[PDB]
């Protein structure tokens, strides 16, 4: 009673204390049902034995731990309010949350945590049953509490947790009583395991995931392990079942494990309790192991995810069954040889992403519908991987990856990103128990699920002899599934699969002791043989992903690189309401957080309601499992896929002339796994019209998988055919143009058709047509465009980055140059009016760009506008290079001949392909929450906008935000749509980079630095 | 207050968690005495701020740990007695001691110990100086308590400790007052870690170490590592000291590395703090490293221990000193290449023994007078390695190694004999940070001293994923020392040098799952490339160490066997008083315990007291350093050094006729290491006379070492010259005897000799000079001998091992056969008598032996016995052929021609040298406390006693004890002389044995297996 009080237990500070990680804690197992029948074990149904505590809660908050009252322990308080379980107490209000990158959210001080600690008093009364109480063991299992945790039961204390990620057990059979029951749960937000939990997330605490009541008899299965062994052709499995049970030992209990495919029974096996002997004292009396023997199993894969039934039924001699234990398996081998990593003898495409658990709505709460809608876009964006990105999932999630066919690779919750040096905890003796307590017990609850292939030490952890040690006890325990880390530079003797965060393709980055060369050079370094996989790669920050084409290509041509994990999946935003209560996403920074980063969590290639980027279009576009060839006539289509053959994909091939479709047809498409198909055309027709012929082809699955709708679209290419140039002559403008020179302005009639030009500045002052105004800004050149986020980089208002390409733009002027007017003259012609302008852009008496311009009017009302554009070879490269416009009419359509239908920019325009798309005004603007450059549509040929129409080859973006709007403003929701329509066309723009978020990623052959530029736009009324 | 209480801290059960193994301890480090100066450090003296709270203490004994009251924890009680701190409180009476082999001596329930907990209360009152509390860090070290202990400083609770053979640091500064202060240690027996602590010795508990207190400044050096890097042919030597602190970081601060031989100083390095950039967030910034380069350093070895003194200080940039820590670094570098453990690139030769911590009064508390007498012994025994024997030793053992120069192979405190299986703890993560506080800490501890060599993880603990993460995490933090590990068979991954125990050599027994090969198949296993070193073998346990010369043989013979570490070195005996209170050493089951193992704990080379055993001088002779070989007439002496050159050490020559010397001669010794010599002896004296001329060589060192006396011998070898045989005839026998044929009996009378026959028993009956009788009993055969200690093995009353050698022998009456008279007959000859018996030995109807004598008296008054033997092919091998009778007279001195002059078997005969040897007769006895067969001498020629004489080739033994009292009594001190004294004088004698106390050990060579045997004796007075 005494002891049972708050003072004995926060006398012990056990949050800050790295030897006491657990108090009274049951060990880990794969999870448990406890099913008392063996067909509802077979059929997954829902047992009565497993109770779900999830729901109305009584929750209080305190400032510190020793602000709780003692009369808490007894019952709950009048004023505590009425939450639901799991949930985080951050997203009520109570708390406000953190995100922080680099830096720990707490004053770093190992291992003591600071003193105003958030505590959070979670109550729940409920009632048990009394057949629960006369036999067996009744447990309670927390799938997560974020940092530490104590328990109480009947205001008796039971035990102590640490873990977050991982479930703690405890038992209550000699605490729960006959009839109504409360407990009480004392939450931390900070603790000495926090040290370890420094992941890239917001820092939210609470009871987060599921709370469940166990019962199960006297005497039990404590443990069961799962493995497969095949022979060279894999026609005969062995499966090799150990059970460890705990409790008293008899001589009639007997093991019954059974195999089942859907109904039909495979295999079984029942021996006896007793195993081989393994040491001088003799073997183990409590385990027994089965051996079956399976005759040609269907392998499980991602292409096709093959699952066996396997229950393990403890009974009796005369049949009587005790319990029952179910689980799924499935038959597949990863083994790395020759520097390979195989599976079923296949070499493996990685085409993985990273992914946290982020819910649009409930923060960290995970809940089935999201899991399951995530999947089907990751299957159908093409990835066959996911990461669970440093820290264990919902175990759900494997059962889900089993289902739908993902490979998974399993993290430690082990992260000391903050401490400097990065290994200081990880070398240190004193804290390998704690990191062995978030490893160990995360390989023995995931060991059984066939999703998981790779485990992982942690990330951004330096090097230390405990992760060696580590990797030394999992390569013992699990020889099966191939293990790696990303500390150390990849390159230690804790990996065993070379994994560099964001590695370049070509050019290297020799940092000091940590250096990350090219992936190709990486393989090609001295003494390595480990095959090289990218867990993190291709950092999708807004406007991001460029370059992705060179870093599949790369995978391909190199037998040895098997791909990457793309960061990450899910955008980290938080909702908000405004004064209207209106919905709008929020960064860090938007709470009230000192040490916090920016937007620096709102990396992905989703929204956070599952909305996708253009970047998904293109990582779709790059992981296609088909590969095209067109030579001549013919098609050569290559399958990736290592396991099944192409029975649910037609091909859909259609030629079009500018837009216009001629001939389209449908072929089946027969292709092995890594096989050949060749696809003969039929004749295609070739008009005498002038325009370029395009051959589009796609491939339909026409059935509907358990991940995909019927139609659905798994691949695509385009090719550009035969070209038949435009020779014919423009009729002669019977109506010549009328020039009026004004003092100030220079004006220029052509019936309904009139422009005005000011003297002044040498802009096209404005357009009319009748007696309606089309421009409400002179018609002016851009030299700059809105900052996006790779461009930005970690540099603040504080702290200055001078490799930033922003800085080096405003630090030259580029943002402040001033047009300074140098020639404007117009003359008539024999039918034709033409203006030459002539401007120059200064800043601090350096010039930076000059911009020569011919206007031609036409008599047929065509405007000819050819500009050259001279750059200074010293100033930092210009990010664009175009004219821009704020037109005086708004509409609904947008009718564009060029690539899409997306957003596609030079370095990210594979996806795109080229034809007519025709879209209303509001698909036009990508809503990035961060303002930047956004909506570009590059190789476009022509450009239908209202009574206007644009021709040439340019790039061009338009929109209601100007781009002074996007640079100021810091949130979607503050843009305000301007009067009129603000267009912006480029002749020609520089890359976007993507490689990573703090340096410049942009490769020289995207970047503008030729030095001499030159584009022709024609600008007419339609 | 009330959490200080008594109830609060035993609420908490830390002795029965596995997951609490410390609360409120410091790191591990080297040992520290912080000295205040540079040249009080340099020349090692004592430090005042370094005091020893070693003394009188304060001492009360509880059953259970919640029987103490809660006023001791203010006041002493005054029951308490006066104890001695260190000491073991079962040495005073409190509590019995129990010895166990295999089996726990609780009941086996992990983590779980029994109710009844014996408890020790410990009270020291001190005073403690102002100065130590201004300023700076006060700490206490208990260099060792057994089990569990709780500390409480003046009332207040301190912290937790569950190590028994690492010591245990806590910070007193917040808890010492000025003035009066008194400390309250609680220390139980049992622990939760007492599981891992299954060691072969006696279980005690009670502070059996130093207790030391510590004062540093507020800035430390907290802990600092040294290792060497060498050349290929090691004459450039570079020092790198890497120094951590603990505290305020400031810019002045700057540490002096310097190193001193002797007193000259060899190299210096002074830097700033602050380390070379490690990770991506930097480098340690309280870390420095110095590199020392040093030309043509002096390598330390076991034969030239050159060491070092390298000073570490901590000062400012003035110069002012804050701290000092001085080491003594030896330049050495162990690497193994080409499955070959090389030091400082020689290849080792290892002839190291087991050692146990066991005082000859005080028990477990070892001094510095004990670890000097033993090192002592075992250089002049020719031992250069030791092993810690399952725990980590002393940390002053380590030093004094370096100082004499032996290798040390360190052990972990892990031993789980009892579990069964015996991987259960080590495979169960649960207990992964608990053997990890056992092996991390060590190795922390004596990673700076050059005696350390191996690191062992620890014995008889199966194999476990534990004990390979373990085994990473030692060659990751510390790649300069190879490791080992027995467990599992040593063929494991855990292991780099296979150490087997007990491995024959060229036997096999092959056990499942893990056999024990012979060793030399065990080098030719396929896949198998590392060298074999023996962690146990030879186990001398009594009369033992048989074999010894093939284990050698084979060591020297094969490159990759390295040699082994012989089981073990001292005897594990208690002293105990009986009524008079007369000391008597005793062994397991003499104090009472039920759960106990009998004398298996007396196993060693010398006694209790450091009193050599007679196997000793056979381990002196198979370890010699130096090899003889004899061709023609010279000799080819080759040297075993490996670093050191022949310069203290001289050859003395002896060529012996009979015993009776010749020539002799001294030739100085000049032997490059691993080299050879030849000597060229001079003319060697062959007389007529009959005899066999024997030369014996020996190696004297002349002058005094550090570890040997003036004219100590090191080596000795001997030949067999030129024969010259016996052709002579004996003079014609003037006088005949003359026989009277009684009914009954045989009386045959020539002069003063007299001899009787029994006609019933067929045996001599009496012999007579003058009018004194000479026998006690009649000379009869003896086909038994004392069983050995080998001979029993694990067989009790109650166990019955079919195997043993004394069950075979039993169950076949081979002890209960009874002589049955067939033949005796006699008839004079023309000058002698000739006596012919015939018996036969028989059991159950069954005929084991039969003996034939043949009796001749000659008239010069000699009787010449002939003995023919011939013994059953199904009967059991019987351990001895001879004769066997009591003489009715005791003498003072015994002087046999043979072998000798210590006691020497038929498989343990190396050592002996032939030649005269004159002896009191109370060495004859070999004081073996536990009785079996002793003090028989092979190769005799010639044996005088008294007025007797015998001649013949014998292997003879003669004691005050009969056989049937040593195999009836079970403790020497109960042993009592008898009348007269016993002499058996056997024909063969079958071998000892000595690979394992558990089996078989005796060859095939050695057995008496041939069936029919003969011997000739010849006994005449002289």
């Not at 059970?243 to 109904?263: H, I, K, N, P």
């Not at 961060?930 to 338009?958: K, V």
Request: charged share 20%.
């Amino acid at each position: 009673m005494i002891t049972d009080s708050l003072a004995v237990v926060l006398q012990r500070r056990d949050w800050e204390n790295p030897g006491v990680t657990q108090l009274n804690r049951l060990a880990a197992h794969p999870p448990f049902a406890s099913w008392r029948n063996s067909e509802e074990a077979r059929t997954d149904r829902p047992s009565q034995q497993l109770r779900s505590l999830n729901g109305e809660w009584r929750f209080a908050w305190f400032p510190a731990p020793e602000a709780v009252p003692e009369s808490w322990l007894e019952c709950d308080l009048p004023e505590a309010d009425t939450v639901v379980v799991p949930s985080n107490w951050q997203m009520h209000g109570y708390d406000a949350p953190i995100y922080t990158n680099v830096t720990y959210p707490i004053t770093v001080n190992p291992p003591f945590v600071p003193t105003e600690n958030p505590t959070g008093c979670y109550s729940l009364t409920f009632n048990v049953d009394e057949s629960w109480l006369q036999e067996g063991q009744t447990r309670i299992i927390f799938d997560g509490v974020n940092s530490a945790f104590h328990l109480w039961c009947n205001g008796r204390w039971v035990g102590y947790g640490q873990d977050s990620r991982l479930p703690s057990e405890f038992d209550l059979s000699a605490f729960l009583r006959a009839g109504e029951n409360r407990l009480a749960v004392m939450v931390l937000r900070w603790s000495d395991g926090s040290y370890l939990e420094d992941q890239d997330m917001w820092r939210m605490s609470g009871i987060f995931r599921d709370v469940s009541l166990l019962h199960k008899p006297t005497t039990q299965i404590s443990d069961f392990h799962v493995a497969t062994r095949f022979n060279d052709d894999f026609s005969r499995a062995v499966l090799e079942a150990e059970v460890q049970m705990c409790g008293e030992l008899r001589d009639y209990l007997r093991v019954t494990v059974s195999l089942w495919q859907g109904e039909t029974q495979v295999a079984s096996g029942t021996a006896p309790f007793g195993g081989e002997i393994i040491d001088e004292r003799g073997g183990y009396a409590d385990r027994v192991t089965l051996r079956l023997n399976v005759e040609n199993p269907k392998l499980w894969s991602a292409e096709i995810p093959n699952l066996y039934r396997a229950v393990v039924e403890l009974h009796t001699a005369d049949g009587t069954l005790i319990e029952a234990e179910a689980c799924d398996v499935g038959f597949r081998e990863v083994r790395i040889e020759n520097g390979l990593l195989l599976l079923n003898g296949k070499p493996l495409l990685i085409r993985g992403v990273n992914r946290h658990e982020h819910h649009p709505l409930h923060g960290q709460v995970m809940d089935e519908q999201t899991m399951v809608q995530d999947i089907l876009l990751m299957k159908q964006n093409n990835f066959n991987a996911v990461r669970c990105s440093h820290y264990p999932n919902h175990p759900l999630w494997y059962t889900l990856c089993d289902r739908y066919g993902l490979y998974v690779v399993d993290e430690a919750n082990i992260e000391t990103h903050g401490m400097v040096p990065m290994n200081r905890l990880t070398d240190d003796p004193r804290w390998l128990p704690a990191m062995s307590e978030r490893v160990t017990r995360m390989v023995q609850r995931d060991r059984n699920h066939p999703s998981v292939i790779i485990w992982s030490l942690g990330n951004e952890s330096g090097h230390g002899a405990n992760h060696d040690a580590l990797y030394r006890w999992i390569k013992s325990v699990d020889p099966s599934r191939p293990v790696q880390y990303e500390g150390g530079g990849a390159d230690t003797t804790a990996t065993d699969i070379i994994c560099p965060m964001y590695a370049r393709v070509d050019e290297d980055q020799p940092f000091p002791a940590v250096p990350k060369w090219s992936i190709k050079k990486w393989l090609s370094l001295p003494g390595e043989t480990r095959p090289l996989i990218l867990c993190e790669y291709a950092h999708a920050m807004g406007n991001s992903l460029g370059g992705f084409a060179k870093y599949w290509q790369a995978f391909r041509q190199y037998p040895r690189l098997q791909g990457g994990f793309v960061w990450d999946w899910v955008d980290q935003s938080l909702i908000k309401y405004d004064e209207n209560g209106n919905p709008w996403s929020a960064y860090g920074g938007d709470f009230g957080d000192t040490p916090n980063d920016r937007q620096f969590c709102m990396n992905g290639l989703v929204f956070a309601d599952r909305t996708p980027h253009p970047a998904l279009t293109e990582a779709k576009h790059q992981q296609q499992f088909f590969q095209f060839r067109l030579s001549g006539q013919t098609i050569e289509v290559t399958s990736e896929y290592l396991f099944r053959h192409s029975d649910n994909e037609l091909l859909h091939w259609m030629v079009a002339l500018d837009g216009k479709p001629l001939a389209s047809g449908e072929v089946p498409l027969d292709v092995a796994p890594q096989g050949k198909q060749l696809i003969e055309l039929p004749e295609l027709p070739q008009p005498e019209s002038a325009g370029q012929l395009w051959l589009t082809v796609r491939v339909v699955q026409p059935n509907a998988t358990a991940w995909s709708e019927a139609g659905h679209i798994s691949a695509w290419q385009q090719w550009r055919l035969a070209e038949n140039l435009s020779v014919t002559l423009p009729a002669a403008s019977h109506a010549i143009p009328h020039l009026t020179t004004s003092e100030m302005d220079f004006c220029i009639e052509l019936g309904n058709k009139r422009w005005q030009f000011n003297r002044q500045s040498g802009f096209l002052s404005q357009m009319w047509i009748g007696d309606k105004k089309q421009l409400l800004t002179p018609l002016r050149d851009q030299f700059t465009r809105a900052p996006l986020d790779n461009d930005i980089g970690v540099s603040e208002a504080t702290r200055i980055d001078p490799n930033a390409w922003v800085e080096r733009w405003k630090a030259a002027g580029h943002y402040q140059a001033e047009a300074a007017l140098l020639q404007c003259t117009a003359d008539t012609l024999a039918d034709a009016v033409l203006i030459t302008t002539a401007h120059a852009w200064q800043h601090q008496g350096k010039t930076l760009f000059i911009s020569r311009k011919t206007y031609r009017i036409d008599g047929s009302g065509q405007m000819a506008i050819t500009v050259d554009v001279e750059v200074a070879s010293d100033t930092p490269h210009p990010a664009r290079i175009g004219l821009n416009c704020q037109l005086a009419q708004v509409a609904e359509r947008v009718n564009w001949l060029g690539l899409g239908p997306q957003e596609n920019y030079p370095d990210r325009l594979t996806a795109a392909c080229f034809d007519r798309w025709d879209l209303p005004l509001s698909d036009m603007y990508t809503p990035y929450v961060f303002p930047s450059e956004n909506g570009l549509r590059c190789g476009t040929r022509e450009l239908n906008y209202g009574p206007h129409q644009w021709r040439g080859d340019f790039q061009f973006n338009i929109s209601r935000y100007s781009q002074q709007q996007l640079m100021e403003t810091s949130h979607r929701h503050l843009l305000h749509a301007e009067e009129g329509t603000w267009l912006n066309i480029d002749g020609f723009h520089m890359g976007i980079g993507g490689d990573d978020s703090w340096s410049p990623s942009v490769s020289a052959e995207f970047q503008l630095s030729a030095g001499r530029y030159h584009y022709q736009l024609v600008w007419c009324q339609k």
